[PDB]
Amino acid sequence: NYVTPRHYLDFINQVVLLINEKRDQLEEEQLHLNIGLKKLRDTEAQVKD
């Protein structure tokens, strides 16, 4: 088997595309998890009020 610079390059490109693909999915889900905890921690203060 042979590993060439060309492999190093694709390696990086994969790491670049996957960190994005993964972060995006996680942040888009943390956002939703926030539109929620607010709406809740709020209704909880309102009700407790």
């Binding site: 088997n1 492999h7 694709d10 390696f11 996957l18 996680l26 998890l33 905890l37 921690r41």
Partner: protein
């Protein structure tokens, strides 16, 4: 009780968000290099990483 559930989901996503870079690096090498070898080389390689 519902809001407590969101809190668990949230913390869970921060954990992932916290281990994404390393998780991706590892998954990349796997996709980039691992292929040629057999289980033993794959296994030992993943451990060095």
């Amino acid at each position: 009780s519902e809001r407590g559930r969101w809190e668990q989901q949230s913390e869970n996503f921060n954990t992932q968000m916290s281990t994404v870079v390393g998780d991706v690096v590892l998954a990349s090498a796997f996709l980039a290099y691992i292929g040629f070898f057999d289980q033993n080389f794959r296994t030992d390689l993943m451990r060095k990483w």
